[model samples]
Target: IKFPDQFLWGAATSAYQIEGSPLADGAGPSIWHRFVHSPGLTAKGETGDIACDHYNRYRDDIALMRSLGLQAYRFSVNWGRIFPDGTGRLNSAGLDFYERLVDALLEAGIEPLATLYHWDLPAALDDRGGWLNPEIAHWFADYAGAMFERLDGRVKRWATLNEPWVITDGGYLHGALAPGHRNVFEAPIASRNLMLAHGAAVQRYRQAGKHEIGLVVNIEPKYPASESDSDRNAAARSDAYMNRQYLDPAFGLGCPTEMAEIFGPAWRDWTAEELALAAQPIDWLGINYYTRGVMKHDDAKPPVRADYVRQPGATYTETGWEVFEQGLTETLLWVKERYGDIPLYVTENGSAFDDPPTAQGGRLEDPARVDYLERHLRAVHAAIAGGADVRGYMAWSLLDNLEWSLGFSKRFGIVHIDFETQQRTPKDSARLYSTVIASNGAVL
Candidate 1:
């Protein structure tokens, strides 16, 4: 091992992104299923109707994951699968599917890091006002409680939700992702409801789960484009709006003051009791960091009034995100400083690059991705050296599948997937990642 002892190495994937047969075996339709099926909502009308077919091919995928030098795996459990209508009755077949997967993973000696929800709300819930409904928090806790009831021991490390900021920002405010709605008021309501659900789930976990639980957040640090007061304030507001909005309240600090200015009257200040509930103690914090935001004041932009500043000659990812590895180190230290020394995991860290459609002679060479992984892991090492208490790293995905509204266009997998043939070819990045895992990041 290259770094600290017991630093786990893993790969991550979500149910809707990798698992096909979305509505099969008594599985209910999800908001994603509805969104993609709508005309013009996804690229080329692409849907997860037959994503990677992981639902039918998990045995093979698990074997592949173990061979890729993964000591652990972070995966999401779709809410629609467990409670077909998002409430009322349980689905045995749906739970049976995950039960088999977890047992196979344990047999292979790979740890399971399970995420209870990953943005795939059951369409039935969407009819009930989704996250905007205050009752959704209790509904989420019911789903979380069932997960704890079923696989508490086999799946020890649990997360209530993944990337609350992205959920509200993309789905509610911008109407970009599933169950899409474009309303400034809806975004703030959805954001707070997510926190309440997270706390309620953790509180439920304490009653049944004998293991660890945390909340995962996607954090992008902000830097001012200039030293001028306006630009500096813009960057701060942007940071407070995106990163601190969820984190501050989760840690009992209450909502960031900048939020009131960002959402104006639309922002609902967390009630003292609501804040108390949202501040329930968590065992850890999972950070999904990809890049940083270089910001400048922009009155043209509503709410936060900050716009992204593109740096000249800087490398960018396929998604137009600036490739800044130092942000990972900064984010880790920031979490430690602001939230106390909470154990952290780099839950989702990887970039989407231009991957070839097929492998050449059984090999896929992605130098950009390999370099991305190397530097990011080195950044994690830097954070650990700075006493960040970072426990592990899970690459964004294990195989290329659906990328939400972008459909199958963006590829972030180290293992390239031939969508036509369903063949998974471990790319050069996977090879390098395996080596880093074997060496415990020593090579980085």
Candidate 2:
């Protein structure tokens, strides 16, 4: 498969997942800090109080990335770490950590693509209404500008927010994630504010810097579980909620369907000004695709009507997400067709498998993970061949770290980490990914 001249190959990680020491070095606690501490919030009631210790071993992590032949590293910064108070006094220790991490990435010949927010809002901010409050747009933008003013020179390819849908649906509506609160009304509000914050940050960056800035939204292509009209319409509504909700605001239009249907009548339409602000043109789009949903309607309740049924006979991740490589190709092309010819990157894509240590003296053996990467890389190459202006592909993670609320149970890494020993070993997927990176999209 022929790839572009500068196709980027990398892996992604977020601060909360890998960089442990959440409150270390004078950093304030984030909502995740408080949430994970709550009883029964995480699997086994485990918290990221000490993740892979990337806070201390980031240099080692970058060295590992370099050895794997990665071209870039897409990582997120914990907003709370940088601004312990959310907005006001900047935390020096927090900036120092990111500064060192960026320097390490640059030294290793890896491009640093920084994601400003990856769902961990400061507990201080959450106390002030968090995303539910409309004023959050300005607050988030202020936070973004602070980081940009400090790290703009070292970092390019900044993503204002990573997957706002998850921020709302998982965190607010479903109450599965941090700051968990079940409110259909709050979900729509959070969605709007998240986009507004994204746009506001980009607008602020444009005024202060010349480098590219973008928004990362998780796009799961929807399919009907059955060919029936109810199923198809359910798929459409799911698509509108999962995909169009973010895209419409990004492109400066309303979501294709009425909000009341997907999000109950408590949802309000955006004002003309909010629509314009939400539609700020971005330099690139970060597409995080893992699986496609096959939907059918559930008439009995709120979020009401639509739900995804598993694709039969498909491999499922530890997170119970389906594994489908073909969805990657379809999703990319869908973006190019639907969102105009905007440049894009697969900022996050990888599967979390039930990988246990090998019997060979505790060595890591993750053949299933390797196969998953191989197929997805082939799928990515397919998208490139099919005329999607895909710039790069970053695996979901470089190492096995915290898997959000699942804690450390799910392993989604090219490299395996023994949480107890903190031992880092390159798994089979890492070897396979290194080969793919070296080959520059050539199918093995």
Candidate 3:
């Protein structure tokens, strides 16, 4: 397998997960700050209050990325940090942090990929219905403009929103994530509104910004476990729900008609004009694929009419997701066909395994993760060979920091973190990834 010149290799992290000082230096508290502080919210009472101390230790982290031969680094800006109330008033300290970070990356010859929002809604906004409120479009647009103004010249690659499906599904539908809520009706509302805010932001960026901007989605290709009609229908709905839900809205195909059948009275359609706002074309689409599910419908109704039964022989990750690398190859092709050949990036991909240390004691030798990367990267090469205008690849994380509700138990980083000592060690796979970077994906 081979890759063209200029294929990007990098790692990513969100502010809430690694920045630690949530309200530090005049920064406002995001919903994640409040949610993680609440009882029974995070695993083992874990909060990102001091996670990796990346805000303070980013110099070292950037050094680590440079050492890894990375040409790009994708990180998010804390929305609340910029606008303490979600609008009006810029925080100098917050902007300074990102300005310095971007400067460091540029100095290191690393491309800066900035995500405008990554699930860290300001508490001030959540107090006023957050994404469910229509006013969020303007609220989010103001914030986006603020960021683009600050970092537009330094950062060339921008993503307005990251994974609206996870934002709505985990936060609203099941209440498993930040500002947790359990209303079925509210879920779709928040989902669509989030996309609308994304459109508004990208539109604003196009107006005033000189950089390229797009939406980032978590795309998992769905397949049927068997040839049975039940399995086939389940796969179809899962595909539309999990994969197309965001892309369709972003690309102007309107909401997936299949969602009504899947959600069964919970799926709501936006007005024609509303869909137009939600469907604005983006310069690129960032596909964050980790695994694929082969569905088998369950008849044991209660929480909707169907539940997905995992395929019998597929490999499973620590996240309980099936280990299917070929899905990455297939998903890129499917996106090209469905969305009419947009430029793409694998914004987030990688798995969480129970990585173990070798006899060397300090270094983690995760062969499984190495295999995972090798297979998926080959899958990526497959997509590029098949005529997908794919350009970049950023792994899910740069460090083991906090893993949301699961806390740090799940390690997805190429560099492992020893929580007790705050020690950072680059795993064997990290070394392998460096070669991939040095070769611009030609290492495959």
Local accuracy by lDDT, each model = 0.91, 0.86, 0.85
Ranking by TM-score: 1, 2, 3
Could you give candidate 2's per-residue lDDT for residues 101-175 as a string of tens digits?
Answer: 898899889999999999899999899999988888899888888888888987988998989988888899878
User: Could you say which candidate leads in lDDT?
Assistant: 1
Candidate 1 lDDT, tens digit per residue, 10-104? Answer: 99999999998989988989999999998977778899988899999999999998889789998999888999999999998989888888999
Off-target runs (Cα >4 Å) in candidate 1 are none
Better of 1 and 3 by TM-score: 1
TM-scores of the candidates in the order shown: 0.98, 0.97, 0.96
Report the error of model 2 at residue 160, Å: 0.5
Q: List the residue pairs that clash in candidate 1.
A: 2-440
Ranked by lDDT from best down, the candidates are: 1, 2, 3
lDDT of 3 by residue, 106-198 (tens): 999999999889999999999988988999999999999988888899899899888898998889988999989988788888988898898
Model 3 collision count? 0
Clashing pairs in 3: none
